[PDB]
Design a protein around this motif. Structure first.
Motif, mmCIF file in Angstrom:
data_model
loop_
_atom_site.group_PDB
_atom_site.id
_atom_site.type_symbol
_atom_site.label_atom_id
_atom_site.label_comp_id
_atom_site.label_asym_id
_atom_site.label_seq_id
_atom_site.Cartn_x
_atom_site.Cartn_y
_atom_site.Cartn_z
ATOM 1 N N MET B 46 3.477 2.562 -5.467
ATOM 2 C CA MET B 46 2.413 1.767 -4.912
ATOM 3 C C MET B 46 2.062 2.311 -3.527
ATOM 4 O O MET B 46 2.971 2.588 -2.757
ATOM 5 N N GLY B 48 -0.859 1.627 -0.189
ATOM 6 C CA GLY B 48 -1.728 0.609 0.296
ATOM 7 C C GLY B 48 -2.342 0.884 1.646
ATOM 8 O O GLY B 48 -1.881 1.743 2.351
ATOM 9 N N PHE B 53 -3.170 -2.804 -1.990
ATOM 10 C CA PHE B 53 -2.392 -1.754 -2.608
ATOM 11 C C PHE B 53 -2.887 -1.411 -4.005
ATOM 12 O O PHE B 53 -3.496 -2.254 -4.672
ATOM 13 N N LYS B 55 -1.561 0.874 -7.642
ATOM 14 C CA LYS B 55 -0.505 1.543 -8.387
ATOM 15 C C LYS B 55 -0.985 2.925 -8.794
ATOM 16 O O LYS B 55 -2.091 3.082 -9.312
#
Ligand SMILES: CC(C)CN(C[C@@H](O)[C@H](Cc1ccccc1)NC(=O)O[C@H]1CCOC1)S(=O)(=O)c1ccc(N)cc1
Ligand SMILES: [Cl-]
Ligand SMILES: [Cl-]
Ligand SMILES: [Cl-]
Ligand code: NA
Lengths: 99, 99
Positions: B46, B48, B53, B55
């Motif tokens: 992840m 961000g 955020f 994936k």
């Protein structure tokens, strides 16, 4: 300076008489800082980042020193992982990318 | 070359046999490309920033030609709004920020 990129390009900025740490970010169109008090009126702005768009506060003609270099320009205030110096102020201090 | 920051610092890259446009981003720790296939193993991650955020899949030891300069390293793949060349590959092409 000539700043290499082996570590994050973090510098000291001065805004509102306070020293803060900020990231020099060529992938940021705009400069955005963590919540603080700035003078004057603000206007609404939408900015896009990796996760999507968010609304922030836009303050114009703010005095800011970046690694000892004087700038006066637009500073956004909102939820940001780090203080970010983006291209609007990078250009004022004469920063370029070189390789 | 020497790239000013009046507009976004975009360059052409070649990755996995494909030409793409990507942003040279001193604020990005790692390179993140829009969805595409790459060979070999990957692991989830992840990442961000502004807006939260996302994936991504982390591929290691990927070669990317950046504006004519070859570099090898980790490439993240996921729903980024913009292809980004981050510090992990900028260092390899000898990119510096100068002011
Ligand atoms: C927020 C910084 C600390 C980190 N990002 C890099 C930034 O350059 C990021 C790049 C970008 C440009 C346009 C759309 C989407 C992303 N610009 C950004 O948000 O511009 C905003 C802030 C003010 O001006 C507008 S990242 O994309 O979250 C990220 C995180 C991890 C990795 N491995 C790679 C990228
Ligand atoms: Cl400005
Ligand atoms: Cl790497
Ligand atoms: Cl070096
Ligand atoms: Na691999």
């Amino acid at each position: 300076p000539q700043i290499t990129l082996w570590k994050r390009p973090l510098v000291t900025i001065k805004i509102g008489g306070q020293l803060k740490e900020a990231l020099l970010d060529t992938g940021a169109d705009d400069t955005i800082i963590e919540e603080m008090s700035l003078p004057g009126r603000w206007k609404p702005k939408m900015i896009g980042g990796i996760g999507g768009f968010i609304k922030v506060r836009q303050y114009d003609q703010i005095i800011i020193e970046i690694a000892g270099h004087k700038a006066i320009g637009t500073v956004l205030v909102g939820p940001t992982p780090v203080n970010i110096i983006g291209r609007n102020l990078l250009t004022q201090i004469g920063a370029t990318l070189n390789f």
